[PDB]
UniProtKB/Swiss-Prot annotation:
Positions annotated as active site in the UniProt record: 39, 69, 224
Descriptive protein name: Proteinase K
GO biological process: proteolysis
Domain of life: Eukaryota
An example Gene Ontology molecular-function term: serine-type endopeptidase activity
Biological role stated in the UniProt entry: Hydrolyzes keratin at aromatic and hydrophobic residues.
Amino acid sequence: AAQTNAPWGLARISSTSPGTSTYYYDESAGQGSCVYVIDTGIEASHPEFEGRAQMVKTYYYSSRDGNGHGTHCAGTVGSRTYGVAKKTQLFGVKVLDDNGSGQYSTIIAGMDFVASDKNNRNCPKGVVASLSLGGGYSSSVNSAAARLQSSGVMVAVAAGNNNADARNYSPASEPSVCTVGASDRYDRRSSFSNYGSVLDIFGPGTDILSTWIGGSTRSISGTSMATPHVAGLAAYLMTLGKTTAASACRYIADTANKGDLSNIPFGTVNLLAYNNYQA
């Protein structure tokens, strides 16, 4: 399948070169997979989600996304226009308040929630969790991400936006999950992207158009935007049967575009997420 005039990041993940604008992908499109977006919530009523999104948990007075961040990330995973895996099921877990903040204890509870809640959902092709969040190093936060991964969920986490080594941030620094840095449309490391040996992969993160609250759209930047590209890619590849939740991060690294990014510090992987779809 071909989506013309796609957001640059979608076109990038199906291309061996920057500078194109059509997204190519297998029409299975993540059908039968599920992606949890652990964030500020999801405006599930947005036409872009087509009834495939729902809130399943909140720790606050509402499950609605009063911020936009979670809706944007969910849109990059799975919206009809802005999403990588256009037929996946999206489940929102609101661990962040409407200012975008959350206590680590709540975030940990949300991760353990997903590890159990997947057993209440129909995801025959597999389960992914997208975590566009983080703070300073915490062994307890890393352990929660490790448990979620161990339980059979492909965990993708943002590297962070400090232009610093991600070893000092959580859950970015957890070795067993997929830690995602950000790139721009010219294949440069995004100016804010964290780096370091703990990164597994880069995805599009600068000037990413996606869904927003109030039934709208906007372009924003962050490792928060790169992470759902990778989460959606994992769901798509799992639906194709090419990989599993336990092996998808490694598979994405195996099949990535290699050596094509600029300003990658010595010792950080030079790997850009790529669907290897041959139309």
